Amino acid sequence: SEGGRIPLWIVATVAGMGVIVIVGLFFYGAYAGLGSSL
Amino acid sequence: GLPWYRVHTVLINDPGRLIAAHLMHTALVAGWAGSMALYELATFDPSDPVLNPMWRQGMFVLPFMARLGVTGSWSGWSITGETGIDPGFWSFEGVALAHIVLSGLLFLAACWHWVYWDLELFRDPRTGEPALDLPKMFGIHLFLAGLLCFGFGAFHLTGLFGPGMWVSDPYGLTGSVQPVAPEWGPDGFNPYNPGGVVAHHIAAGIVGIIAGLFHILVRPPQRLYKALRMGNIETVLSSSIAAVFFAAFVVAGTMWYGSATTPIELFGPTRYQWDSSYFQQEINRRVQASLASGATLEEAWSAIPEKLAFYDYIGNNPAKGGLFRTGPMNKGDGIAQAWKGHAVFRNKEGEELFVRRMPAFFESFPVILTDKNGVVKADIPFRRAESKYSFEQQGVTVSFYGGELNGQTFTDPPTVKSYARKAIFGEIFEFDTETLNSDGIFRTSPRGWFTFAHAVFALLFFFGHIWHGARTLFRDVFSGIDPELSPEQVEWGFYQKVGDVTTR
Amino acid sequence: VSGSLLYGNNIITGAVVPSSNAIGLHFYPIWEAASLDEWLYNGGPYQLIIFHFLLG
Amino acid sequence: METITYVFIFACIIALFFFAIFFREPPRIT
Amino acid sequence: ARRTWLGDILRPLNSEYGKVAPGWGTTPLMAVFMGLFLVFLLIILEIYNSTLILDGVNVSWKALG
Amino acid sequence: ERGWFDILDDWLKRDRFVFVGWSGILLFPCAYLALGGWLTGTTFVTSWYTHGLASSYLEGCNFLTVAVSTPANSMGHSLLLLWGPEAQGDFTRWCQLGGLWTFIALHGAFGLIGFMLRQFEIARLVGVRPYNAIAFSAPIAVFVSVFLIYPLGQSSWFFAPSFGVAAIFRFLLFFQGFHNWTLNPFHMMGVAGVLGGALLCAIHGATVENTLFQDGEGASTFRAFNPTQAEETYSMVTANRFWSQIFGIAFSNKRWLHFFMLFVPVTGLWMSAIGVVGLALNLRSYDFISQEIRAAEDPEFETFYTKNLLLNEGIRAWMAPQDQPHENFVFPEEVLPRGNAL
Amino acid sequence: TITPSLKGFFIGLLSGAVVLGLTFAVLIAISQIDKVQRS
Amino acid sequence: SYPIFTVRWVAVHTLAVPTIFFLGAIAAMQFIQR
Amino acid sequence: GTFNFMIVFQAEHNILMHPFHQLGVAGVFGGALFCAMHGSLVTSSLIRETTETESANYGYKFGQEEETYNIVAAHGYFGRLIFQYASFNNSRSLHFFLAAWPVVGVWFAALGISTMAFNLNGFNFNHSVIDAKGNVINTWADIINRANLGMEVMHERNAHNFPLDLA
Amino acid sequence: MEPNPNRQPVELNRTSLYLGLLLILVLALLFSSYFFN
Amino acid sequence: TTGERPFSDIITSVRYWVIHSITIPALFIAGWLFVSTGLAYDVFGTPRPDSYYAQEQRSIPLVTDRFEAKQQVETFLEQLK
Ligand code: CLA
Ligand code: CLA
C-alpha cells in the first residue's frame, strides 16, 4: 500500500534480470527446435 | 513586403479581383482545352479506327469529346470510320473554336472585373467592409449545379435533347454514341452499366436542386458557423480542395479499373484484361464455336476480327510504359498495320506447344513453351552447354492461321524463335516503325497517363487541404503564438480541461 | 566501362570508375604508369581522387 | 549538346556557390 | 463603392454576411444525411470491390452486351 | 449552452496522463487494433496459403523474419472483411486468407488519420500553430502511396508490402529488380530529403551543444538550463561565424533554420510518394532510351547503368517463381540468366 | 433477394453501429458522472 | 488520496495484459520440436 | 555506380539482414523524423512578432538575446501528443539527442560496411524453418535469398572462372 | 481610378534568390538526364 | 502532474506486488498453455510441423479462387488425410 517499501533499484534490477532471461530463452530457441535449421 | 509564395493573398478581401483572377484561370483552362484539341486534330490520323485508333496516337482530349457525342470532323471523317458525314457545327473543330472564343470572352470579363473591383455588391451593407455571404452563395451555386446536373442527365445523356454518350459491347468492338435510358434498379450502381450514369445525373441533380434551395433559405447553425469559420473564405478553399481530391482519386480509379465512362475504344484496354486474358478467352471461345460449326482451322482464325486480336497484345496494356518514355504508343512498337495471324507452335512429335506470356511486371521475359498441361517442352536457352529444350533439339515449328500469314508454316529455327519471342506479347502484329522512327520500347496509353496525373494531383491536393484547413482553424495564431501566453496554460494539472481557464 | 559524359554518359549514368582489379591494392600514382593513356585505361584517376579526398 | 547542357548547369552551380559565399548579404547583429 | 444596374438587382443575395440560426439549429438533420451518405459510399465501394454482390448486378465489362 | 455534447467535450479534453480528445475516439481503437493485429499475426499466423511461407514465431520465425503477409493474388483488391464473401465470418479461414493484412492496413490508415487529427486538436487547445500536423502529412503520403495506391494500381494486395522486417527488405529488392527504383528521380529526391534531414538533425544538435553559453559551474552542462529562461542557451552569433568560416555559409535566422528542418525531410518523403504512385502503374524510370539504342548496336559500350540492368534481370528471373507463386512459373535451368561460373 | 453478401453487409453495418453506439453511450455516461468543476 | 481505475490504468492494461500472455506463448514455442 | 555497389554488396553480404545497417536505417529515418519533429515544434511555437503580410522570419533578428520560440508551449504540446515524460523540457538534452541519434546510427552504418569488409555478414536464415519430414518451409528470408542469387549470378558476368566468389 | 487598398509590395531577399536558384539548378541537373532520355 | 498516482509510488508498494505476483504469472502461464495445448494452431489455422504437406506432396496449397477460397482451404486440409 505504502509507496517506497520495495526500493526502486531492486524493482529495476529484478525486472531487468527478467528481461535478460526471457530474451536469452528466445536466443536459445534460435538454436533448438523450430527455426533452428536442424 | 509579401513573400513570393503569398502574392495571391491580396485577393482574400477583394471579391471583385478574386472574381477577375478566377475568370483569368477559367480563360487559361478553356484556352488550354481549345489549343489541345487543335494540336490533336493537327496530328491525329483518322484513317484506321481498327489498328490505329486515338489511344494508340497519344490523344488525350479527343476521347473526352467522343465520350459525350462529338465524333466527326468538318473534313468529313468520323472516329468510327465513317465517311461523308456532316457533324454540323459541333465537330471536334467546332468544339475547339468554341473553347477558344470562350477563353477570349472570359479574358475580357477578367479585365473588367479587375478594373471595376470596387462594386457596392461586394460590400456588407451594415459595415461598408468587403464581404461575401458564403453560406448563401453555396446554396445558389449548388442549386445551379443541381439544375445543370439534372439537365445533363435528363436531356443530353438520354438523347431526349442531346446526342447521348459512348457505349460499346463487352469487347470494345462496335462502340458508338447512343442515347441511354436511366437504370433505376440496383444495377444502376454497377460502374459498367451506362444507365447508372444517366440515373446518377437525374437523381443527384434533383437532390442538388433541393439541397440548394435548403442552403439558399436556411441559415447555418451558430455552432457550425463558428466551428467551420464560415465568415472566412479560406474555409471554403479547404473543403473544396478536399472535395476535389476525393473526385480526383475516383476518376483515377475508374480510369484504371474501367467503367462505362472510360471505354476501351477511347482510352485503350485495361491492365486487368491482360492479367486475366480477357480477350484471349473470348477469341478462343469464338474459334471453338467456329470449329464446332464445321469451319477449318484457317477459317476459324480468319473469322477473328483484327480489332479483337489487337486487344490481346501486351503492347496495348497500359501497365507496360515508362515515366520518361514520351508520346504516343505508336512511337514505341510502331504504327500497327495488320495482324499476322494466330501462331500455333508444334514440336517434332506434332504436339501443340504454348508460349508462356509475359506478365506486365516484367521488362524482359524468357521464352518457354509448354504442352497443354504446363509441362516444359521447348525454350530459348541462355547457357547452351546443357540445353535439353532448344528449338533445334525439339524440332519446333510454327504455323499461322488467319491474318497475313494464314496457311504458312515456318520450320527454320531462327524464324520459329523470332515468332516465339513475339508470342510472349500475345497476338502478333506487323508494325510500321519507320514513319515515326519508333524505338521498339513500350509506352503507356491515355488510360495510363490520365491515371498517373490524377492520382498524383489528388495526393498533392491532400496537402493543399491540410494546409488551408490549418490556416482556417488557426488564423488567430498564424503570425505566431501569444507573447503573453501563461506557462500555466501548458503546465499539467493546472486546468482540469486542457486550455480552458474556467477549470483552474 | 565508360564513365564520362563525352563517352556516352549522362549525369545519372556517369562516374569516375574504380581502378583495375589487376592493380588490386597496389598504389597506382600517375608516375607508375608508362603514359597518361595507360593511367586512364587502368583507372588511375579514381585512386588520385579518393586518396586526396579522404586526406582532405 | 547534352554534355554541354550538363556542364553548363554544373558551371552555373559553381558560380552560384561563389556568389552565395563571397557576395552574401552580411549577417548583422541589430 | 460603385453601384450598377446588375449590382442593385443582386444586392439582396449578398446582404446577409454573418447571419446564423440559433445554437445547434439543423445540425442533427445534417448528421443523419451525413450518416446516410457514408452508408451510400460504402455500398457503392463494396459493389465495385466485389465485397457486396447483388443479384442482376454483374460488376464486369460483360455487364450486359 | 450546456448540453451533453459540451459535457462530453469537457471529459474528452481533460488534462490527464494520456490525452484523449475527440480524435482519440478514432485514434485509440484503430492504432490499438493495427498494432494488436501485427503482434497477433507475427506471433501466431501463417502465410502458407497466401504465399507458401511460414511467417510467425509459432512456426519458428524470428523477429527479423516474422510478418503479417498480404493476401493471395487471387483475392485481387478485396477488402477481405471478416464478414465478407471470402471468409464468410470464419475467423480461422479469415486469418488463413490474409484478412489480417487488410485489417492492419485499414485500421492503420484510419489510425494515422486519428493521429494527425490529434496533432491538430492538441495544437488548438494549447494555442500553438499546427506545423507538427502539417509535417505529419509526409508519413501519411508515404503510407497511403506505398500500402494503398501501389497495390491498387497492381494486380492485387499481394504486391503491397507485407508487414515484416524481412518482408519489407524483399519489397526493396523487388522494386530494384522490377522497377529499377534507384534510377527514379522521385526516389532520389526522397533519399536527399531523408539523408539531408538526418544531416540537419545531427549538425544542428551538435552546433547548439557546442556553442552553449556557460550558465552553470558543472562540467556536465545539462543542468545549466531552465525551461522558463528568456535567454538563448547557445550563441547564434558564434555558431554563425563558425559555419561561415568552415563551410562558407551559415544560418543567421533561427526561424528560417527551424522551418528548413521541417521542409527538407517532409518534402523528400512527399517526392518519394509521387514516384511510388507512378510505380503503381509500372510507370517507371527504368531505362535511358539513348543508352539502350547505343548498347544494342555497339557490344563494346558499357556503363554502370547497363550493368545494373543485368543485375535486375537476374533478380527477376531468380526470385519470380518463389516470389510470385500464383504465376506457376517454371524456368528450366537452361533459361536462367547467369554470368560465367556463378 | 438478400444474397449472402448483402446479409454480410447488414451484419457489418449492425456490428459497426453497435460498436459506435456502445462507445458513445459509455463515454456520455462517464462524462455525466465525472463532471469538470467550474467557477 | 489517488484513484485506481483511470484512463491511464486502462491504457496500461490494454498493452501489458496481452504482452505478458504473448511472452508466455512465445516462451512455450521455444520448446516446440519439428 | 553507387547503386551498382549497393546491389553487389547485398548479393555478397546480405547487408539488409545485418543489424549494423539496420541501426543505420534507424539512424537516418530517425534523423529525418526528429529533424522534421524539431523543425515543426519550434516553428509551431514561434512568438508573434510580425503581421500576416510579412514572413514570420522577420520576427527573429540575428544575435538577439531572447529565445524566439516558447519551449514551454512546445513541450506543453508534445508532452500531450504522447505523454508528459516522453517530451524534452531541457533544450540542451533535446539538442544532444538530435546530435546523438543520427551520429550513433551512422557510426553503426559505417561499421557495418567496415566489418562486412571482412566478410562477417548479415543474418543467414536460409532454410532455417523445416517441417516434420524435413521439407524446407520458406520464409521471407528465403525470398530475399532468391533475389540475392539473381544479383550474385549476374554481376561481373565475365569475371569469374571458378564456382565460388571468395572476394 | 481610385487606387486599390489591397495592394502589397512583394519581396525576395538575396538569400532567397540564392536558395531558389540552387533549387532550380539542382532540379535541372537531376531531371535533365530524363528529359534527354 | 495530471492527478494519477505516480508510477514509482505504485511499483514500489507491497500491494501492487501482492496483486501482480499473481496476475503476471497467471497471464504468462495462460499464454504458455495456449501454445502447449495446441489451441493456438486451431484458433489461427496455422500448420503444425506435420501439416504443411501430405506425405508425398511437394506443391504449395495456394488459394487460387477468391469466392471459393474458404472451400479450397478446407479441401487442402482434407487432403492431409
Ligand atoms: C438511383 C440514383 C443513382 C444512381 C443509379 C447512381 C449511380 C452512380 N453514382 Mg450517384 N448519387 C446519387 C444517386 C445515384 N447515383 C445521389 C442522390 C447522390 C447525392 C448527391 C449521389 C452522389 C454520388 C457520389 C459522391 C458518387 C456517386 C457515384 C455513382 C457511381 C457509382 C459507381 C462508381 O463508379 O463508383 C466509383 C466511386 C466509388 C466506389 C466511391 C469511392 C469512395 C472512396 C473509397 C471513399 C474514400 C475517399 C478517399 C479520398 C480515398 C483515399 C484513399 C485512397 C487514395 C487509397 C454511379 C454512376 C460515384 C462516382 O461518381 O463514380 C464514378 C461517387 O463517388 N454518386
Ligand atoms: C492531366 C495532365 C495531362 C496528361 C495525363 C496528358 C497526356 C498525354 N499527352 Mg498532353 N499536355 C498537357 C496535359 C496532359 N497531357 C498540358 C498541360 C500540355 C501543354 C504543355 C500538354 C501538351 C501535350 C503535347 C504537345 C503532347 C502531349 C502528349 C500526351 C501523351 C504523352 C504524355 C507524355 O509523354 O508525358 C510525359 C510525362 C512526363 C515526362 C512526366 C513529367 C514529370 C515532370 C517533369 C515532373 C516535374 C518534377 C518537379 C519539377 C519537382 C518539383 C520538386 C519541388 C516541389 C521540390 C499523353 C496521352 C503527346 C502526344 O502524343 O500528342 C498526340 C504530345 O505530343 N501533351
Ligand code: CLA
Ligand atoms: C484550388 C486550389 C488552390 C488555390 C486557389 C490555392 C490558393 C492559395 N494558396 Mg494553396 N495549395 C494548394 C491548392 C490551392 N491553393 C495545393 C494543391 C497545395 C499543395 C501543392 C497547396 C499548398 C500551399 C502552400 C504551402 C501555400 C499555399 C498558399 C496559397 C495562397 C497564396 C498562393 C500564392 O501566392 O502562390 C504564389 C505562387 C507562385 C508565385 C508560383 C508557384 C509556382 C508553382 C509551385 C509551380 C508552377 C505551377 C503551375 C503554373 C501550375 C499548373 C496548374 C496545376 C494545377 C497543374 C492562396 C490563398 C500560401 C499561403 O497560404 O499564403 C498565406 C502558402 O504558403 N498553398
Ligand code: CLA
Ligand atoms: C473508430 C473505431 C473504428 C473504425 C474507424 C473501424 C473501421 C473498420 N473496421 Mg474495426 N473494430 C473496432 C473499431 C473501429 N473499426 C473495434 C472497437 C473492434 C472490436 C469489436 C473492431 C473490430 C473489427 C473487425 C473484426 C473488423 C473490423 C473491420 C473494419 C473495416 C470495415 C468496417 C465496416 O465496414 O463497418 C461498417 C459499419 C459502419 C461504417 C457503421 C455505420 C454507422 C451508420 C452511420 C449508422 C447506420 C447503422 C444502422 C443503425 C443499421 C441499420 C441496418 C438495417 C437496415 C439492417 C474498417 C477499416 C473489418 C476489417 O478490418 O477487414 C479487413 C473487420 O473484419 N473491425
Ligand code: CLA
Ligand atoms: C489525415 C487525414 C485528414 C486530416 C488530419 C484532416 C484534417 C482536417 N480536416 Mg479533412 N478530410 C479528409 C482527411 C483529413 N482531414 C478526407 C479523406 C476527406 C474526404 C474528402 C476530408 C474532408 C474534409 C472536409 C470537407 C473538411 C475537412 C476539414 C478538416 C479540418 C478539421 C477536422 C475535420 O473536419 O476532420 C474530419 C474528420 C475525419 C477526416 C475523420 C473521418 C473518420 C471517418 C468518418 C471514419 C470512417 C470509417 C469507415 C466508414 C470504415 C469503412 C472503411 C472501408 C474502406 C471499408 C482539419 C484540417 C474541415 C475544415 O477544413 O475546416 C476548416 C472541412 O470543412 N476535411
Ligand SMILES: CCCCCCCCCCCCCCCC(=O)OC[C@H](COP(=O)(O)OC[C@@H](O)CO)OC(=O)CCCCCCCCCCCCCCC
Ligand atoms: C558514455 C557512453 C558513450 C556512448 C557513445 C557516444 C554517444 C554520445 C556521442 C554522440 C556525439 C554527437 C555529437 C556531439 C554532441 C555533443 O557535443 O555532446 C555534448 C554532450 C554534453 O556535453 P557536456 O560537456 O555537458 O558533457 C560531457 C563531458 O564534458 C562530461 O560532463 O555530451 C554528452 O552528453 C555525452 C554523454 C555521454 C553518455 C551518453 C551515452 C549515450 C549512448 C549510449 C549507447 C547506446 C547505443 C546502443 C545501440 C543499440
Ligand SMILES: CC1=C(/C=C/C(C)=C/C=C/C(C)=C/C=C/C=C(C)/C=C/C=C(C)/C=C/C2=C(C)CCCC2(C)C)C(C)(C)CCC1
Ligand atoms: C482575346 C479574344 C479572342 C481570343 C482568344 C484566344 C486566341 C485565346 C487563347 C488562348 C490560349 C491559346 C491559351 C492557352 C493556354 C494554355 C495553358 C494554360 C497551358 C498550360 C500549361 C501547363 C500548366 C502546363 C504544365 C505542365 C508542363 C509544362 C510539363 C509537364 C507537367 C505539367 C502538365 C504540370 C477572341 C477572338 C475570341 C475574341 C475576344 C477577344
Ligand SMILES: CC1=C(/C=C/C(C)=C/C=C/C(C)=C/C=C/C=C(C)/C=C/C=C(C)/C=C/C2=C(C)CCCC2(C)C)C(C)(C)CCC1
Ligand atoms: C487482431 C484482432 C483483434 C485484436 C487483437 C489484439 C488487440 C491484440 C493484441 C495484442 C498485443 C498487444 C500483443 C502483444 C505483445 C507483445 C509482445 C510480444 C512483446 C514483446 C516484446 C519484446 C520481446 C521486447 C523486447 C525488447 C525490445 C523490443 C526493446 C529493447 C530490448 C528487448 C530485446 C528487451 C480483434 C480481437 C479485435 C479482432 C480480430 C483481429
Ligand SMILES: [Ca+2]
Ligand atoms: Ca529507326
Ligand SMILES: [Ca+2]
Ligand atoms: Ca519429429
Ligand SMILES: [Cl-]
Ligand atoms: Cl556488376
Ligand SMILES: [Cl-]
Ligand atoms: Cl574466379
Ligand SMILES: [Fe+2]
Ligand atoms: Fe533547435
Ligand SMILES: [Mg+2]
Ligand atoms: Mg526454436
